[PDB]
Amino acid sequence: SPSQVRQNYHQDAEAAINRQINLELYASYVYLSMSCYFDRDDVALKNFAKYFLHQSHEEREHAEKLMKLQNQRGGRIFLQDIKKPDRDDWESGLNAMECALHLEKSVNQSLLELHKLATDKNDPHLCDFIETYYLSEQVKSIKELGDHVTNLRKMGAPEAGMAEYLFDKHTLGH
Amino acid sequence: SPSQVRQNYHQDAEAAINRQINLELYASYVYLSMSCYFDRDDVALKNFAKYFLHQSHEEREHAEKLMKLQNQRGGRIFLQDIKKPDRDDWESGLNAMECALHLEKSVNQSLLELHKLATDKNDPHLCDFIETYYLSEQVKSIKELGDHVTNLRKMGAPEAGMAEYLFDKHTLGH
Amino acid sequence: SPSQVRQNYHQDAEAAINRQINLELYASYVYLSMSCYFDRDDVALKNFAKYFLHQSHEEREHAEKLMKLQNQRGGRIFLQDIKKPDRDDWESGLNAMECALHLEKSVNQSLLELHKLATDKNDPHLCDFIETYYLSEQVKSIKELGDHVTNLRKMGAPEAGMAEYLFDKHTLGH
Amino acid sequence: SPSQVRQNYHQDAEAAINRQINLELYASYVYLSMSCYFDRDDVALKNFAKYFLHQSHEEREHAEKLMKLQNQRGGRIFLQDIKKPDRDDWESGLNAMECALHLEKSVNQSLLELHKLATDKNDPHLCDFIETYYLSEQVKSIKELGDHVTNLRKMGAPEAGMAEYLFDKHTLGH
Amino acid sequence: SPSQVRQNYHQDAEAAINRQINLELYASYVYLSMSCYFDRDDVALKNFAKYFLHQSHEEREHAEKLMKLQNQRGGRIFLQDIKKPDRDDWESGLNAMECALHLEKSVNQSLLELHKLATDKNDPHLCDFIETYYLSEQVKSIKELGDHVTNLRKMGAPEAGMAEYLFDKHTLGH
Amino acid sequence: SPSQVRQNYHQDAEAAINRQINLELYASYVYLSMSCYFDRDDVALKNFAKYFLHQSHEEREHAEKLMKLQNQRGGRIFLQDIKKPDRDDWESGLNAMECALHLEKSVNQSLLELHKLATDKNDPHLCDFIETYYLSEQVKSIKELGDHVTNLRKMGAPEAGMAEYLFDKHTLGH
Ligand SMILES: [Fe+3]
Ligand SMILES: [Fe+3]
Ligand SMILES: [Fe+3]
Ligand SMILES: [K+]
Ligand SMILES: [K+]
Ligand SMILES: [K+]
Ligand SMILES: [K+]
Ligand SMILES: [K+]
Ligand SMILES: [K+]
Ligand SMILES: [Mg+2]
Ligand SMILES: [Mg+2]
Ligand SMILES: [Mg+2]
Ligand SMILES: [Mg+2]
Ligand SMILES: [Mg+2]
Ligand SMILES: [Mg+2]
Ligand SMILES: [Mg+2]
Ligand SMILES: [Mg+2]
Ligand SMILES: [Mg+2]
């Protein structure tokens, strides 16, 4: 008994969209963990915390947009557990940026697999949705994170004590 | 003797674009018929008539955009008869919404076949045009019509006399 | 079983109004064909295309006003096929203007026959509607088209290459 | 090795705050599931979906405020899995409101246990935080949900088809 | 040793992007040559010169956007010589427009080959970038140039002395 | 067959102006290469990239002003290949600034030779043009680049990791 709006929407695509929803929610949760780490009194990097809180909210928005797509196409959303992040302690601004880069590249790889599936199922609307709202955003975010990692490494983080402080002020405070 | 601007524009794509122009014009004409049905003194649902008149004008705009694409790519527009709609009497707001949903899904299926043809002919500009201006609009319209059908059915239309009146006021009057 | 609003509205007038609706829709379609002809890369007269697109939209508005009259008087709208225009290629700005003049005079003749019928059936409201909204507009349009034809002919169109270019800039660009 | 800011902050309170963070995140996730249910084409109650999306965002904000408290007091945030909601299909607006009322009363009971623990540990700052930011908000939300449930039941939901439609327009659309 | 941001970016695509950068820079240089030709005291067509200077700056912007893409994806930009244009003397406004049309169609063919390569390498981000920022712009520019060529030819350029003067005033001066 | 506007404009000066046009275009291309180097994810100095992009655009403007002079005096512009820059990798902000200083001093030496030629040919208009639009600008740019080199060296660039980061923020970010 398919939805009255469903058209050219393969069941495999519906399942993959549900998986991507869970992945975006997990990414939001990871970014939230990082943000709270930098709010610690013994870390105390306010702009790192703000940066990762903003990333967390953006990932949640991505998840919600995918749910809207799922309903728009007549798919049915099936939520799963949002697993806790791998770490409680992210150990430095540089390490958190590197972990964020790894996470964003994993999310991008998932979106590329999703696009490959949509191409295989001849779903141009789903392909276009992924390209328009996800792929370019992912490439921009990956480039920005790589830039941050490069600058933190060059400045001497985490060993150079002033590196993360000044990067927090100059790059993330503006 | 091809057009001086023609490049990577297959004759099959040109023909399919002409067919799609006729289909959009036909859809506009169907929506016009519906709008006039709800303007009848014995139907008298002003916001249904306004909704379908707006849909008719939008379909005409879609047709004109396709003609602009045809000229932009060096194709030649060949117009055909615009067939009269299948019905003169659309019998209820719920029935007209259901017929509109059927029509929009048929138009979407035609656009998906058109996109498949453009992909087969390796015409990325035509593919991108269809995705950007037609596919997402079609999915949005299909979802909106499905929502209207669901609400009208739940409210008890057409048997429940106040259903279409109140839906006209609350959903289509805002 | 006549409409509850029907009064002094002869069946012959209702049928003639339906025929006039089809004629106005056909005129709109002819003007659309002309507009698209002047959008061709090998014709490329933007203001001719704009002029005829505006005429097409005006004719559609005339058709819709007639449908509103049909419902207002308790008549029932019966749509027919909108026949494709006689030509795909309109061959020049002067030729398109001459064809438009011929079309507008045919539409005017139909409206005059309609007014004669309304007078014969003693339908003063229908007579007044035709006079107020259609007859003066038709005479103005016929005079404007005749003026355009005269100017294009005097300038040397279509043989004089700059004639249609300069007429497009000066008369239709302002 | 306690935090340099830690003062009068019992380990039991820290653990209970972590549990409350997980509960608020779970509540946000439940509300998100409800919001997406009402976005379905076969449910199509836009203002119910908006109401529950707003509730989801508010619960996330509550979770984040608790994390800020945890860091402010020198506690350490330990995140856990966010369990998926008990249902995918919430079956009606009335049922979703009743489930939301049950959820909010469970969250309130958890906050009351948390306040009892803070009183037992003589932590007036934590007590005041719970009272100021959580208890009154919970009582207001519980009262609002009870009001919605009462009105939906009186209107005849879900059996009365127009009940949830009109409640969506009048109570949740303003 | 790939870039830390590189993902799903084939070496062939990187090389093709470098080639496209050189092609856009070359196109900018050709347009600059044309602009300077129309600034000559013995040609003296100011709006032709302005048109081609604007085209030159636009092509440079296209090149810079491609370089930004190359860095964003982790590719490495390798610049090559920018070859001088084929002509110093462009001989007339009509001839320059025809040469510009030929150049733009060659650039479009290169972008279509680039899109084919990206499709073959399953690089949806690169495909979408080409479609979004290059393909539609190319089709629009080709259509505009074809229109200019048609109008100049019809007006009698270059033999008709007033043709290019009046086209410079009316089409390129507005 | 000299130009109708040509007066007191030696052929040697015309040739030297053509050479200077090529040199300015080459300088613009070198600055573009530098700008793109600092946009790399593994360099990631945004304000260095902005500084050199601005320099590239300024050099292009200088080239265009020279072409305007060439036409104004009745000379004929003859474009040549724009050679690729000597390096793809500029290795550091300090090294790029030093290379830019070397380039600007070479351009200044060329302009001084050009002024010497114009003085020898008794061309006061060309002399005044070089003095007014080129010589003072060159001295200002050379002084600014020398200042940047001095500051980067004193700060410890490139060995001191924070040197180029902070110089990018403080000197080039304001
Ligand atoms: Fe500083
Ligand atoms: Fe009501
Ligand atoms: Fe004129
Ligand atoms: K730590
Ligand atoms: K009926
Ligand atoms: K023709
Ligand atoms: K249900
Ligand atoms: K010449
Ligand atoms: K390097
Ligand atoms: Mg995301
Ligand atoms: Mg696309
Ligand atoms: Mg349409
Ligand atoms: Mg008319
Ligand atoms: Mg709460
Ligand atoms: Mg108190
Ligand atoms: Mg270009
Ligand atoms: Mg210079
Ligand atoms: Mg002087």
The residues placing their C-beta within 5 Å of ligand 13, an ion, are C 59, 62
- Whole-number Å distance, alpha carbon A149 to ligand 9 midpoint, is 15
**B155 with D161: Cβ contact below 8 A:** yes
Q: Which of C100, C85, C54, C66 is nearest to B82 (CA)?
A: C85
Resolution (A): 1.5
Prior bond of B158 cis (ω within 30°) = yes
Name the 3-class secondary structure at C82.
strand
Q: How many CA atoms lie within 13 A of E44 on its CB side?
A: 8
- Whole-number Å distance, alpha carbon F144 to ligand 6 midpoint, is 62
Chain A partners of E73 at a C-beta cutoff of 8 Å? 139
Chain E partners of A136 at a C-beta cutoff of 8 Å? 125, 128-129
**F39 with E71: Cβ contact below 8 A:** yes
Q: Are F117 and F12 in contact (CB under 8 A)?
A: yes
In whole angstroms, give the CA distance from residue D21 to residue D65.
9
Distances (CA, A) of E109 to A64, E140, E142: 39, 14, 12
DSSP state string for chain E: ---TT--S--HHHHHHHHHHHHHHHHHHHHHHHHHHHHTSTTT--HHHHHHHHHHHHHHHHHHHHHHHHHHHTT-------BPPPS-S---SHHHHHHHHHHHHHHHHHHHHHHHHHHHHTT-HHHHHHHIIIIIHHHHHHHHHHHHHHHHHHHHTTTTSHHHHHHHHHHTTT-
What are the residues whose beta carbons fall under 8 Å from the beta carbon of B83, sequence distance 6 or more?
A: B26, B29, C81
- Whole-number Å distance, alpha carbon E111 to ligand 11 midpoint, is 15
Q: Are A164 and A98 in contact (CB under 8 A)?
A: no
DSSP state string for F19-30: HHHHHHHHHHHH
Prior bond of D158 cis (ω within 30°) = yes
Q: Is A77 left (phi over 0), alpha (psi -120 to 50) or beta?
A: beta
Nearest to C42 among B3, B40, B79 (CB): B3
* Structure-token pair, residue C149: 């034809």
In whole angstroms, give the CA distance from residue C51 to residue A62.
46
- Whole-number Å distance, alpha carbon F131 to ligand 18 midpoint, is 6
Instruction: Give the minimum alpha-carbon distance from E101 to chain C in angstroms, rounded to a whole number.
Output: 12
First to last CA, chain A: 53
Is residue A11 a known part of a binding site? no
Chain B touches chain E, with at least 3 Cβ pairs below 8 Å, answer yes
Instruction: Give the minimum alpha-carbon distance from A55 to chain F in angstroms, rounded to a whole number.
Output: 20
Nearest to E5 among F33, F41, F83 (CB): F41
Distances (CA, A) of B169 to B47, B163, B172: 7, 10, 6
Q: Which of A25, A24, A45, A20 is nearest to A34 (CA)?
A: A45
- Residue F82, φ and ψ in degrees, nearest 5: -95, 110
- Residue D171, φ and ψ in degrees, nearest 5: -90, -45
Nearest to C161 among E146, E148, E155 (CB): E155
Distances (CA, A) of E166 to B169, E97, E158, E172: 57, 15, 12, 9
In whole angstroms, give the CA distance from residue F139 to residue F132.
12
In whole angstroms, give the CA distance from residue F166 to residue F170.
6
Counting ligands in written order, which one lies closest to the CA of residue F130?
18
The number of residues making up chain E comes to 174
What are the residues whose beta carbons fall under 8 Å from the beta carbon of A159, sequence distance 6 or more?
A: none
In whole angstroms, give the CA distance from residue E107 to residue E97.
15
DSSP state string for C83-150: PPPS-S---SHHHHHHHHHHHHHHHHHHHHHHHHHHHHTT-HHHHHHHIIIIIHHHHHHHHHHHHHHH
Q: Fill in the DSSP letter of residue B92.
A: S
- Whole-number Å distance, alpha carbon F104 to ligand 1 midpoint, is 30
Chain C touches chain F, with at least 3 Cβ pairs below 8 Å, answer no
DSSP state string for B5-30: T--S--HHHHHHHHHHHHHHHHHHHH
H helices present in A39-92, as ranges: 46-72
* Rounded (10°) angle between helices D46-72 and D161-170: 50
**F161 with A166: Cβ contact below 8 A:** no
* Rounded (10°) angle between helices F46-72 and F11-38: 160
First to last CA, chain B: 53
Q: Which chains touch E (3 or more CB pairs under 8 A)?
A: A, B, C, F
**C79 with B84: Cβ contact below 8 A:** yes
**E42 with F4: Cβ contact below 8 A:** yes
Q: Which residues of E touch A (CB under 8 A)?
A: 3-5, 7-8, 71-74, 122, 124-125, 127-129
b/e F11-22 (16+ beta carbons within 10 angstroms → b): eebbebbbebbb
Distances (CA, A) of C84 to B134, C50, D8, E149, F88: 25, 20, 87, 31, 62
The number of residues making up chain F comes to 174
The number of residues making up chain D comes to 174
Q: Which of E53, E23, E168 is nearest to F67 (CA)?
A: E53
- Residue D82, φ and ψ in degrees, nearest 5: -95, 110
Question: Tokens 């309130």 belong to which residue?
Answer: D108
Prior bond of B2 cis (ω within 30°) = no
**A39 with D64: Cβ contact below 8 A:** no
Angle, CA of B72, B73 and B77, to the nearest 5° = 80
First to last CA, chain E: 53
For C79, other C-beta atoms within 10 Å of its C-beta total 22
* Residues paired with D82 in a beta bridge: A82
Q: Are B18 and B69 in contact (CB under 8 A)?
A: no
In whole angstroms, give the CA distance from residue A146 to residue E74.
10
First to last CA, chain C: 53
Q: Give the sign of the dihedral formed by CA D39, CA D43, CA D47, CA D51.
A: negative
What are the residues whose beta carbons fall under 8 Å from the beta carbon of B166, sequence distance 6 or more?
A: B155, D162, D165, D166
Q: Which of D97, D106, D128, D102 is nearest to D115 (CA)?
A: D128
In whole angstroms, give the CA distance from residue C46 to residue C43.
9
Q: Which of D102, D75, D101 is nearest to D13 (CA)?
A: D75
**D43 with B155: Cβ contact below 8 A:** no
Rg (CA), chain A: 18
What are the residues whose beta carbons fall under 8 Å from the beta carbon of E56, sequence distance 6 or more?
A: E28, E29, E30, E31, E32, E35
Long-range contacts made by residues B62-67, C-beta under 8 angstroms, separation at least 24? B62/B24, B62/B133, B62/B134, B62/B137, B63/B21, B63/B24, B63/B25, B63/B28, B64/C32, B64/C53, B65/B133, B66/B17, B66/B20, B66/B21, B66/B24, B67/B21, B67/C32, B67/C36, B67/C39
Q: Give the sign of the dihedral formed by CA F85, CA F89, CA F92, CA F93.
A: positive
- Whole-number Å distance, alpha carbon F83 to ligand 16 midpoint, is 21
Nearest to B36 among C29, C36, C71 (CB): C71
* Residues paired with F82 in a beta bridge: E82
**B3 with E142: Cβ contact below 8 A:** no
Counting ligands in written order, which one lies closest to the CA of residue D1?
4
b/e A97-134 (16+ beta carbons within 10 angstroms → b): bbbbbebbbebbebbbebbebbbebebbbbbbbbbeeb
Prior bond of A158 cis (ω within 30°) = yes
**B72 with E140: Cβ contact below 8 A:** yes
Name the 3-class secondary structure at B119.
helix
Counting ligands in written order, which one lies closest to the CA of residue A125?
11
Q: Are E6 and E73 in contact (CB under 8 A)?
A: yes
What is the CATH number that goes with domain B11-171? 1.20.1260.10
Q: Are D56 and D28 in contact (CB under 8 A)?
A: yes
Question: Tokens 């806790």 belong to which residue?
Answer: A84
Q: What chain A residue is nearest to B115 in terms of C-alpha separation?
A: A124
